[PDB]
Amino acid sequence: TNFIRQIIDEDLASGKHTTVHTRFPPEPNGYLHIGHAKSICLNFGIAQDYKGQCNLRFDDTNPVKEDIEYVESIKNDVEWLGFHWSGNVRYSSDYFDQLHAYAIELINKGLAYVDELTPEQIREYRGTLTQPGKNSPYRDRSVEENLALFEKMRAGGFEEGKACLRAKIDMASPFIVMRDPVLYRIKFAEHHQTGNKWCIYPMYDFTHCISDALEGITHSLCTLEFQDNRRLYDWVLDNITIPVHPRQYEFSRLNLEYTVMSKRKLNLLVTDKHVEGWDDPRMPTISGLRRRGYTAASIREFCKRIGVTKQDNTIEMASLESCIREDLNENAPRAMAVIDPVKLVIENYQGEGEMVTMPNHPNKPEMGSRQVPFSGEIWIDRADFREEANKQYKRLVLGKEVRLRNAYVIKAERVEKDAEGNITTIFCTYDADTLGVIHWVSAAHALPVEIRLYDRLFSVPNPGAADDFLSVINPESLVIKQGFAEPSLKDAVAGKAFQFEREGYFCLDSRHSTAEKPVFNRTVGLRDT
RNA sequence: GGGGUAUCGCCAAGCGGUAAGGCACCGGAUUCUGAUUCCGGCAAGCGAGGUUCGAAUCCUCGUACCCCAGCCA
Numbered sequence A: 001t002n003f004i005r006q007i008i009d010e011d012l013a014s015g016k017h018t019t020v021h022t023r024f025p026p027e028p029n030g031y032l033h034i035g036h037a038k039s040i041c042l043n044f045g046i047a048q049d050y051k052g053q054c055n056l057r058f059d060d061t062n063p064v065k066e067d068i069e070y071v072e073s074i075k076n077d078v079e080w081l082g083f084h085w086s087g088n089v090r091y092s093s094d095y096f097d098q099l100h101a102y103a104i105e106l107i108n109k110g111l112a113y114v115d116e117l118t119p120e121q122i123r124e125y126r127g128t129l130t131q132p133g134k135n136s137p138y139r140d141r142s143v144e145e146n147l148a149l150f151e152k153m154r155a156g157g158f159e160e161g162k163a164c165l166r167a168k169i170d171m172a173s174p175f176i177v178m179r180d181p182v183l184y185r186i187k188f189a190e191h192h193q194t195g196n197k198w199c200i201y202p203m204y205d206f207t208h209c210i211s212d213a214l215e216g217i218t219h220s221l222c223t224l225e226f227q228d229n230r231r232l233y234d235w236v237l238d239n240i241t242i243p244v245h246p247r248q249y250e251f252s253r254l255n256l257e258y259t260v261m262s263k264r265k266l267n268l269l270v271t272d273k274h275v276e277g278w279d280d281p282r283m284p285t286i287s288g289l290r291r292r293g294y295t296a297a298s299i300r301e302f303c304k305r306i307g308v309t310k311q312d313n314t315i316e317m318a319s320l321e322s323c324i325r326e327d328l329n330e331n332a333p334r335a336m337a338v339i340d341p342v343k344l345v346i347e348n349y350q351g352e353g354e355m356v357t358m359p360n361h362p363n364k365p366e367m368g369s370r371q372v373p374f375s376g377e378i379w380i381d382r383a384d385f386r387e388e389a390n391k392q393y394k395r396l397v398l399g400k401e402v403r404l405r406n407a408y409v410i411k412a413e414r415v416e417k418d419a420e421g422n423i424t425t426i427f428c429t430y431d432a433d434t435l436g437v438i439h440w441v442s443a444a445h446a447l448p449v450e451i452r453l454y455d456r457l458f459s460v461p462n463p464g465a466a467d468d469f470l471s472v473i474n475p476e477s478l479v480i481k482q483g484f485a486e487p488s489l490k491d492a493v494a495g496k497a498f499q500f501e502r503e504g505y506f507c508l509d510s511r512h513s514t515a516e517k518p519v520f521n522r523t524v525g526l527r528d529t
Numbered sequence B: 001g002g003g004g005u006a007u008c009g010c011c012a013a014g015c016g017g018u019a020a021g022g023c024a025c026c027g028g029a030u031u032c033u034g035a036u037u038c039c040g041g042c043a044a045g046c047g048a049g050g051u052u053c054g055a056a057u058c059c060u061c062g063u064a065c066c067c068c069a070g071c072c073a
């Protein structure tokens, strides 16, 4: 429950509404991100929980900012998250003729006029946060003139910026949005849905309430920046001949630490090429989170966990991570991979290897077991061998043994180095029937793999607030390693994620991995303390 | 000027009745993943008054922060 669901209850009880009808209206000017997922779970979850409906509407009022690429993706991510919208997908542009007819009703009613103040002029006349605005000299034209002037605008008779339709409200309002807001402006730009049938486009404030009203939205849910705009939303509906009046409720938008959640900044990372694309695994987009290895289910739990309030907030990465870990910890099958490999030779082992039975999920036998090859020339992670160590360092020491994962207890008794004194091979001896701990990979049956270790995109908790957010990008957000995975991973499918024991949850990077060079994405590492 | 928000490190309940839950964090028990699971601990309600038997929940005075001067959304 949240303040909005409590409002909905009250409405239902009082009898103000018998059903609920919400909507998610993203402008198609970028890809969806985790914040949108908060708005999606909210609007679609509420709908289904109350057995109501929720529309997907593309608020496409600004042609020069949108693209058909984005609409195809948005539907995609909405469905991927697990939600279904009511009826066909809606577009604000589906109401372009209705909006126009309404502008004419306002004009006829005397509440709108065609203003000819330049774009700089309008701002000069607008007033300030503490100084009232002033009426334009064109404010008092006749209904007849406004009707003709507006049509002139519609027919392409005016150059861009040369005219616009404004609402005749109150230029001294303490609410800046009520100081004769613009309803329509001239843009000779082709629209992704209506082509070039229109040269004048409606503004958000005029478009949003009418679309909602027409669709029968019972609760228009949006973020806090639109708190001031509500006054205009109610004005527009109070002043046109329309049968319903959806009510608006605002909540705080999600902010996630170490990341930027704004289409404009996410666009820049994409445009300047500082990430592979909108779907780069380090991106906070739904597609990036997906490519990274997140489950639509873990994102929904995330939204369920963070809540819906009016308090501004900034969630920590730890919280999101807890969600995906909680999912993959139970569902992911274990496997063996080595990110940094140092050769280890068990001179005590004779033969060309053998096979060892390995569990697919330690704490869950039902997931089955697999047969993995063992031998005397394996691979281990460098961090596992230390010539020296305290009572706590549990791995391999140059005068001690350790349990090779799902296999034998071995004991390092020598080592060998190269020029820089870097070790190249560790010589050990194994025990007969020996079946800390360490994962491994037999060098003979080792699938060469490209591992991708991701990290926070930015090096500061609040990159948005930085002077130039791009200069604070983390140079280690991605660190590509060549390692070795046990041969079973040979059949990894870009879709499932396995747990690389003692390392993290990886998923076949569904973007670069060829049949020859598999590329794996590290979704999230394990909790390490 | 106006609109909003002020609870534990981060979120977030409680809506006059005597402070939930999650994440983080500090311990302990398990464990062939220093993981998991597992129990145990953890603070708190902007200041100042004011009504009340009693408020985090009501009221006033402040204070702090956030949003609004796109022919963006």
Ligand SMILES: NC(=O)CC[C@H](N)C(=O)NS(=O)(=O)OC[C@H]1O[C@@H](n2cnc3c(N)ncnc32)[C@H](O)[C@@H]1O
Pocket: A025, A026, A027, A028, A035, A036, A038, A039, A059, A208, A221, A222, A223, A226, A252, A253, A254, A255, A261, B073
């Ligand atoms: N009255 C409204 O809802 C305004 C819709 C407007 N077209 C819009 O803001 N376009 S948008 O594409 O930028 O966003 C669409 C909706 O996504 C949600 N949203 C966007 N960013 C969000 C964030 N960081 N946290 C939570 N919710 C967020 C809002 O409901 C937004 O309206």
